[PDB]
Design a binder for this molecule. Structure first.
Ligand SMILES: Cc1cc2nc3c(=O)[nH]c(=O)nc-3n(C[C@H](O)[C@H](O)[C@H](O)COP(=O)(O)OP(=O)(O)OC[C@H]3O[C@@H](n4cnc5c(N)ncnc54)[C@H](O)[C@@H]3O)c2cc1C
Ligand SMILES: Cc1cc2nc3c(=O)[nH]c(=O)nc-3n(C[C@H](O)[C@H](O)[C@H](O)COP(=O)(O)OP(=O)(O)OC[C@H]3O[C@@H](n4cnc5c(N)ncnc54)[C@H](O)[C@@H]3O)c2cc1C
Ligand SMILES: CNc1cnn(-c2cccc(C(F)(F)F)c2)c(=O)c1Cl
Ligand SMILES: CNc1cnn(-c2cccc(C(F)(F)F)c2)c(=O)c1Cl
Lengths: 470, 467
């Protein structure tokens, strides 16, 4: 009858998704972004030479249903560059050598996965393969209630209990743990790995990977902004929320911006990271279970390194690679994998530096030195730390000391639903209660779930608007 | 019933309590007479001067106890069973302080969870031993009721050798299981006993899952049954020991004469006492009837239940039952961890079953505690020392039952009596009577249900005999 004016704080994938689905429902979203860039943890920047550098190396999976829906709804499915159904891992014992898990396109799930492990002979011994299959069979047969019960254990703890060899946890699962939450298996919750392993057994192409064809603010965030604006929604940059001002009853009066501007609406959404929300929670809310539980959810440090080399590397892949390094996580030659970043004579390597706890405080030259020392192990005939072989033209080190929430055991009960106990106040973000981890899929789903909760409360939110008018 | 039957029951153990419960449900008037000043019998417990409880035994409730589950549900006390993890934790005699376990996945059904548990465990069985064990047992588990009854002629040690189960498996795994079920070694125990126990692992998914009662059995389990019986018109009387079964000239029961001479009469009479006590009270004129003469084979087995309260809270303990795999001890548990009412955060109490107890029921309490402390020094080598160098004993309680459950030696099954006796108006209840769930709490409760069922089936004949 009358469209709701919903004020959303933060234009990350959660905020952009909340705005997109509220606009589809016929409401008026007001999306306020603190920075001069869209995307949040997917944001990228163009330097003086016209080259892009990102907050992180982002991989889209087949088992990302809400992301697939969003891309389809915006008609940008062709912007995802799907790579070969393989998992390429480096050999730390054999420098320059790589091993891989190839998933046959003729075998369905989980047979393609079982085959990939059976076919590979350099990453697991036959006894190790048997113990691994024994240890995981009860887990894959298990339901949702089973995976939730595993949130009390670390990956290293659960692997030992299920009899999975300690070498399998160190060879295969160190790589998977750092890939999903930038921490080692001795700290990561087993529930995280089980949701990731569910990609391999549910859908056939669930574990298949894709790269975005260019920078995320232009190629993904702009299509969402254009869609929101075309339906009457507002998207404003450099609009940081300074304070959540409250009415005497405890509900939200307005969102006070950094320039003093007070923004009002029928509903209010905080699509900001959990760390920023925790600092902005009003004193009168601080003892409510919903907001007090959030103390367990703390952002994990991560570093995204970009290195442009003078030559085009002769030994590279049109894929993501698991470095199996103690300092690095996943990496990719963006001059090969990304369409907009394609260069035939100059190759660029975008690498995730994790765990980053002891590195976010160190200098960019210190980080580049450590990265070059690790690259000399992956490319021993092409890259040398003293730049004897390939030479660095330029670099970009993007540090996020508080990125996704550290998915340590027992975080799941602390994760809040999109509907808050404060009437008119809602939450969005990868950290909120949703089944697809602290991911791009999690962010988009939390947005869809937030917009859904707002439209479900339309009757109560419209009546509250006119009661205050009296 | 047109006119409710007055049924006199001798013994308020789980069999007597169950007989009284189901007779009251049928609309009859049970008169439950207990010899002692405590309810439960072999599940009875006592509160000492310091207010701490000590039990007749360490009792474990299993998922494969259908009549116990029904009773708890009927009384609405299901929450009084503290279900533990689906695991079987065993001690390592070769490696003191170390423990091995069989974990049953909650995602796999029965017997796959069991097969997985054995496959996953690598320190209690070698791969060849696992194969020989699986081969030896597969025909048995596939077997019907007629097959398990045919195995009653063999000892556990005899049958394991015949089926090709390695002698090390019988000594490693089955010594622990034999002492757990009947407080005797596999060279004496009937194979039928082990097969009924192994049926817990393949029938229901949680059949082998274990539970502890949340407190002392007389208050937490026996009182709810007594309250239920009394609310429906039934009578429960303590310190009422039956001295004699007085007979009419035709051979039937005239009355039950108590210790103080009091004569108690009814339309039907039930003996829910242990087989040893019944055998002594059988009238001379019944003694040569096959039904009562067969009972000579069924003799109570000695058992000792040790309780030790220590000054410290043990750092290395479990919220579970443990198989000591000791030559003197059987199963044990830290009751300060497993039992709700017995919970203590700074003081840990260990309740241990001392079996075989034949050479120990005669020995002093200090002699038994010394032997227990010597065995505990092997299970807790960095926490408990026999000379009390490490953890110190605050107090102890040694409960001896020289004639507990019947010794389930081979060929006892044909001697086990049905609940309906050849004497008109006289019935039997108890774990020893003919029922398929062994000499257990489940057996006791089922025998009670079967006894009450036989009494109500004979209502027409029992009501006419009254007039
Ligand atoms: C190195 C790296 C690699 C990653 N790789 C992957 C991958 O391979 N696959 C995958 O699925 N995910 C990956 N992710 C995770 C993914 O980026 C996040 O899960 C997701 O983008 C977070 O979405 P969000 O919208 O909830 O939060 P954010 O994107 O962080 O959005 C919050 C927004 O709120 C804004 N904001 C903050 N404070 C205020 C304020 N006071 N007022 C207004 N606005 C404010 C911020 O500027 C930001 O734009 C990776 C992340 C990193 C950092
Ligand atoms: C150490 C120990 C550990 C055990 N562990 C387990 C376990 O883990 N799981 C399990 O299922 N079972 C276990 N049991 C077995 C279980 O306790 C018995 O199977 C069951 O309680 C016996 O039930 P019942 O009613 O037939 O006999 P009882 O419980 O012995 O009852 C007979 C009653 O008759 C009374 N009585 C005797 N003479 C007279 C008389 N003349 N007049 C009147 N009353 C009389 C007695 O005082 C007693 O109360 C254990 C037993 C012991 C001792
Ligand atoms: C920050 N979250 C991330 C980050 N990376 N990946 C990821 C990327 C590449 C490979 C893999 C893996 F194959 F290991 F699951 C995960 C995620 O799936 C999630 Cl949920
Ligand atoms: C005196 N009867 C008993 C005594 N103990 N247990 C028992 C308790 C714990 C563990 C096990 C076992 F797992 F071995 F079967 C049996 C019984 O099942 C019966 Cl029937």
């Amino acid at each position: 009858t009358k469209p709701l004016q919903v004020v959303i704080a933060g234009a990350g994938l959660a905020g952009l998704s909340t705005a997109k689905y509220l606009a589809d429902a016929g409401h008026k979203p007001i999306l306020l972004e603190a920075r001069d860039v869209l995307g949040g943890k997917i944001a990228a920047w163009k330097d003086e030479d016209g080259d892009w550098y990102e907050t992180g190396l982002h991989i889209f999976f087949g088992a990302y249903p809400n992301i697939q829906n969003l891309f389809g709804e915006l008609g940008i499915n062709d912007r995802l560059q799907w790579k070969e159904h393989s998992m390429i891992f480096a050999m730390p014992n054999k420098p320059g050598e790589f091993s891989r898990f190839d998933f046959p396109e003729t075998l369905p799930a989980p047979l393609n996965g079982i085959w990939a492990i059976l076919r590979n002979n350099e990453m697991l011994t036959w006894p190790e393969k048997v113990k691994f299959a024994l240890g995981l069979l009860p887990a894959m047969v298990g339901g949702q209630a089973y995976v939730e019960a595993q949130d009390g254990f670390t990956v290293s703890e659960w692997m030992k209990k299920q009899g999975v060899p300690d070498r399998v946890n160190d060879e295969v699962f160190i790589a998977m743990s750092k890939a999903l939450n930038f921490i080692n298996p001795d700290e990561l919750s087993m529930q995280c790995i089980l949701i990731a392993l569910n990609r391999f057994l549910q859908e056939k192409h669930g574990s298949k990977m894709a790269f975005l064809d260019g920078n995320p603010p232009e190629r993904l965030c702009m299509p969402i902004v254009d869609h929101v604006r075309s339906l009457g929604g507002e998207v404003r940059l450099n609009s940081r929320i300074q304070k959540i001002e409250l009415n005497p009853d405890g509900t939200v009066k307005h969102f006070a911006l950094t320039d003093g501007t007070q923004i009002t609406g029928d509903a209010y959404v905080f699509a900001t990271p959990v760390d920023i929300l925790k600092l902005l929670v009003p004193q009168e809310w601080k003892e409510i279970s919903y907001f007090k539980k959030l103390e367990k959810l703390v952002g994990v440090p991560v570093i995204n390194v970009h290195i442009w080399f003078d030559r085009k590397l002769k030994n590279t892949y049109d894929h993501l690679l698991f470095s199996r390094s103690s300092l690095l996580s996943v990496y990719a030659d963006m001059s090969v994998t990304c369409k907009e970043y394609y260069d035939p004579n100059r190759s660029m390597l975008e690498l995730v530096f994790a765990p980053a706890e002891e590195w976010v405080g160190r200098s960019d030259t210190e980080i580049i030195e450590a990265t070059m020392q690790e690259l000399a192990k992956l490319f021993p005939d092409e890259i040398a730390a003293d730049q004897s072989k390939a030479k660095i033209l330029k670099y970009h080190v993007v540090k996020t000391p508080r990125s996704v929430y550290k998915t340590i055991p027992d975080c799941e009960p602390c994760r809040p639903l999109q509907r808050s106990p404060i009437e008119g106040f809602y939450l969005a973000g990868d950290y909120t209660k949703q089944k697809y981890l602290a991911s791009m899929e999690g962010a988009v789903l939390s947005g869809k779930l937030c917009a859904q909760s707002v439209v479900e409360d339309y009757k109560m939110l419209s009546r509250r608007s006119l009661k205050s008018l009296q």
